[PDB]
Every structure is written in structure tokens, then in C-alpha cells.
């Protein structure tokens, strides 16, 4: 009100949730190809397979681990939930 | 994208592609005598100074 | 005119950061992507890098960035497993494609089917545990090469 | 006014800071020229993404 | 009053500078452990990406 003013960013946080929502869908559908070029479709146990690889793990390790492995994903993602919901000081680098 | 649990997506054929990034490396460099700036040469202003 | 010196000198200290960050940048872009063949996506540029050069600025450099781009694509059916003979076989490079009738295994990034065999595949345990797999021949080159 | 250019430098630094907050946030998110729908049947072999 | 508002905005380009190379960590990670798969040691985490 003393001549200081908030001006608004350009994209919303509308606009925001829908670039990372198609990085997501991109990601999950298609792996890194459509990082590089258009997007390939491939399932998505075949491209955790190629992750697989990418780490010196062979794919058969996933393909025959494949529910385990989904089950610790899956496990793993609700922690995140239970984490943000609990915690007071993971977003301490926003809020600062 | 046309994704299912049995379909795969592959490339016949490639596009090599040339792109150009360009990147600041320096500014010029620019000197100032702060006393000549501030007092133009008066004897004056530089005992002040 | 003194604080307008300071001024001055203060927004050069902090404009002067801004480029030496910029020239480490640049300095990372000509070890990583004209001194070598970067993997890290994006660095060099968009699609798979091949070479960059290096081309002089005013007070700047600019890399052409040579990349790779998969351009025609086509939709093939495929499975992570080939069953054989009760064995499971896997791609030891590539994957597995079907033109709707054949089975083939290609390279990822470029179509070339190849005819499935005990040299492209490697074998890990059975038909049992693998979801998606499907029944096919793998074709062995030792035993017509001996009949 | 004695004081000449003072406010127009300050107020072209904060103008400066303001168009920078627009460019991270594109250079961060607009990564991609396409937005990318998530098919339908959600059947990520058994991976859940809800 | 001047002398306040020299301050605030110095404060506030130092300050745009740290938030800058944060966002430009960000882009890289953008790039580099969501649309790619990295092999550079705890650049996306810890353990094998």
C-alpha cells in the first residue's frame, strides 16, 4: 500500500499442475523417449526392465520380481503421503 | 499416446539434427579512477575526498 | 557521486557473477560436448547427442550441437519373454516385436528385426513366473550347421 | 528530482528480478512442447501412480 | 528512505541470484533424472537411479 505491489507470475498453478501432470503421463508411458524426440509408447514393466539394465541389473531380475517390485513401489509411495502429512520441516526450503 | 500393455513404438529411420546454444563468457572490462569521477581534477574536492 | 559509484561497483559484482557462472557452463559444454560424447539429457542439446562444436563469440561461444533424432516410428506388438521349451528367454540387447503374424528381435532405437536365436537371447528360468510372455520358436544356428 | 537517475535504476533491477521469476519457472516446467494424457486403463503392471 | 530502498533491492538481486541457480538445478534435474535415467552419483537420490 506504501507504492510496494505483488505483481502475478505468468503461469498459474493450473498451468503448473498440467505441465507436470504431461511430464508424468510422458514419463509412465513412454520412458525417456519422449525426452529425446516423440514419445514411444512402451509398457511399463519393458521400460523398468531397461531401467533395470541401465543399472548393471539383468531384466529377467525385474520380470521375475515384477510384483515384489511393483509392491515396494507402491509401499514406497504411500510412505510419501505419511511423510507430508506427519512432518513440519521437509518444505523448510520453501517456506524460507 | 497410444500406450497399452502389449504395444512398443519404434523408429525406422533418424533425423540428424544441428542446433545452436549460445552462452556469455565475458564482459567487458571497464576501469574507473573513483577520484577522477568524483572530483574532476579540482584539489578541492580530493582533500575532501 | 559516491553513491553513485557504489551503486554502480555493486551491480557489476553482482552482474559479474551471472557471467562467470555462464562461462563455467560454457566451460562444462565444451569438456562434456566437444571434448567428449555426453549421456546426461539435455546438456547438449535435444535428441541423443553425437559431437557438438565449438564456434567464437562476441565476449561468448556458441556449440553447434549435433544430435540424433528417431523420426518414423511404427507400432509393433511385444512381450517381455519368448517361451520355448518350458525356458524363458529374454533380449540380451534390444527387444522382442511382432509384425502381427512373425516374431523378431530389433535393437531399441532403430528398426532392424533379426530372426530369434540362442545368440541374441539369454535364458533364465521358466514359462512360469514371467507376465506378458508368449509361445514361440527360438531358433538354434549349432544344429543345422551340424545337420 | 536532485538526486537524478536513482528510482528509474532501482525500479529497472526489480523489473529485471520479475521477468527472471517467469523465465525459471518456464525453463523448469516447460520441458515439453506436447501435454501428454495418461491413457484411461491405468494398467502400469501393477505399478500404482494415483 | 533511499537509502532503505538501496538496501531492500540489493538484498533482493543477491537474493534472485541464489533462487537462479536453484531453478537452474531444478531444469537440470527436470532434464536429467525425469526425462532421462542418470548415472551420476546422488544427482537424483540416493541409491541406483
Same mark, same amino acid.
Given at each position: 500500500?506504501?507504492?510496494?505491489?505483488?505483481?502475478?507470475?505468468?503461469?498459474?498453478?493450473?498451468?503448473?499442475?498440467?505441465?507436470?501432470?504431461?511430464?508424468?503421463?510422458?514419463?509412465?508411458?513412454?520412458?525417456?523417449?519422449?525426452?529425446?524426440?516423440?514419445?514411444?509408447?512402451?509398457?511399463?514393466?519393458?521400460?523398468?526392465?531397461?531401467?533395470?539394465?541401465?543399472?548393471?541389473?539383468?531384466?529377467?531380475?525385474?520380470?521375475?520380481?515384477?510384483?515384489?517390485?511393483?509392491?515396494?513401489?507402491?509401499?514406497?509411495?504411500?510412505?510419501?503421503?505419511?511423510?507430508?502429512?506427519?512432518?513440519?520441516?521437509?518444505?523448510?526450503?520453501?517456506?524460507? | 499416446?497410444?500406450?497399452?500393455?502389449?504395444?512398443?513404438?519404434?523408429? =525406422?529411420?533418424?533425423?540428424?539434427?544441428? %542446433?545452436?546454444? /549460445?552462452?556469455?563468457? *565475458?564482459? =567487458?572490462?571497464?576501469?574507473?579512477?573513483? %577520484?577522477?569521477? /568524483?572530483?574532476?581534477? *579540482?584539489?578541492?574536492?580530493?582533500?575532501?575526498? | 557521486?559516491?553513491?553513485?559509484?557504489?551503486?554502480?561497483?555493486?551491480?557489476?559484482?553482482?552482474?559479474?557473477?551471472?557471467?562467470?557462472?555462464?562461462?563455467?557452463?560454457?566451460?562444462?559444454?565444451?569438456?562434456?560436448?566437444?571434448?567428449?560424447?555426453?549421456?546426461?539429457?539435455?546438456?547438449?542439446?535435444?535428441?541423443?547427442?553425437?559431437?557438438?562444436?565449438?564456434?567464437?563469440?562476441?565476449?561468448?561461444?556458441?556449440?553447434?550441437?549435433?544430435?540424433?533424432?528417431?523420426?518414423?516410428?511404427?507400432?509393433?506388438?511385444?512381450?517381455?519373454?519368448?517361451?520355448?521349451?518350458?525356458?524363458?528367454?529374454?533380449?540380451?540387447?534390444?527387444?522382442?516385436?511382432?509384425?502381427?503374424?512373425?516374431?523378431?528381435?530389433?535393437?531399441?532405437?532403430?528398426?532392424?528385426?533379426?530372426?530369434?536365436?540362442?545368440?541374441?537371447?539369454?535364458?533364465?528360468?521358466?514359462?512360469?513366473?514371467?507376465?506378458?510372455?508368449?509361445?514361440?520358436?527360438?531358433?538354434?544356428?549349432?544344429?543345422?550347421?551340424?545337420? | 528530482?536532485?538526486?537524478?537517475?536513482?528510482?528509474?535504476?532501482?525500479?529497472?533491477?526489480?523489473?529485471?528480478?520479475?521477468?527472471?521469476?517467469?523465465?525459471?519457472?518456464?525453463?523448469?516446467?516447460?520441458?515439453?512442447?506436447?501435454?501428454?494424457?495418461?491413457?484411461?486403463?491405468?494398467?502400469?503392471?501393477?505399478?500404482?501412480?494415483?
Amino acid at each position: 500500500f506504501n507504492g510496494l505491489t505483488v505483481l502475478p507470475p505468468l503461469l498459474t498453478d493450473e498451468m503448473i499442475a498440467q505441465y507436470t501432470s504431461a511430464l508424468l503421463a510422458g514419463t509412465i508411458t513412454s520412458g525417456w523417449t519422449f525426452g529425446a524426440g516423440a514419445a514411444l509408447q512402451i509398457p511399463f514393466a519393458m521400460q523398468m526392465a531397461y531401467r533395470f539394465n541401465g543399472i548393471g541389473v539383468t531384466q529377467n531380475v525385474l520380470y521375475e520380481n515384477q510384483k515384489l517390485i511393483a509392491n515396494q513401489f507402491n509401499s514406497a509411495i504411500g510412505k510419501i503421503q505419511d511423510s507430508l502429512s506427519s512432518t513440519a520441516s521437509a518444505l523448510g526450503k520453501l517456506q524460507n | 499416446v497410444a500406450y497399452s500393455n502389449n504395444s512398443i513404438a519404434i523408429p =525406422t529411420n533418424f533425423t540428424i539434427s544441428v %542446433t545452436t546454444e /549460445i552462452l556469455p563468457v *565475458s564482459m =567487458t572490462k571497464t576501469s574507473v579512477d573513483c %577520484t577522477m569521477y /568524483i572530483c574532476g581534477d *579540482s584539489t578541492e574536492c580530493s582533500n575532501l575526498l | 557521486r559516491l553513491q553513485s559509484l557504489q551503486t554502480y561497483v555493486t551491480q557489476q559484482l553482482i552482474r559479474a557473477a551471472e557471467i562467470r557462472a555462464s562461462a563455467n557452463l560454457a566451460a562444462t559444454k565444451m569438456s562434456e560436448c566437444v571434448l567428449g560424447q555426453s549421456k546426461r539429457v539435455d546438456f547438449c542439446g535435444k535428441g541423443y547427442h553425437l559431437m557438438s562444436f565449438p564456434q567464437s563469440a562476441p565476449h561468448g561461444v556458441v556449440f553447434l550441437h549435433v544430435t540424433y533424432v528417431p523420426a518414423q516410428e511404427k507400432n509393433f506388438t511385444t512381450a517381455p519373454a519368448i517361451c520355448h521349451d518350458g525356458k524363458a528367454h529374454f533380449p540380451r540387447e534390444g527387444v522382442f516385436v511382432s509384425n502381427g503374424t512373425h516374431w523378431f528381435v530389433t535393437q531399441r532405437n532403430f528398426y532392424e528385426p533379426q530372426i530369434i536365436t540362442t545368440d541374441n537371447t539369454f535364458v533364465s528360468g521358466n514359462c512360469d513366473v514371467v507376465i506378458g510372455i508368449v509361445n514361440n520358436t527360438v531358433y538354434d544356428p549349432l544344429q543345422p550347421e551340424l545337420d | 528530482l536532485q538526486y537524478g537517475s536513482f528510482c528509474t535504476q532501482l525500479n529497472r533491477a526489480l523489473t529485471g528480478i520479475a521477468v527472471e521469476q517467469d523465465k525459471n519457472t518456464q525453463e523448469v516446467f516447460a520441458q515439453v512442447k506436447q501435454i501428454y494424457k495418461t491413457p484411461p486403463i491405468k494398467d502400469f503392471g501393477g505399478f500404482n501412480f494415483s
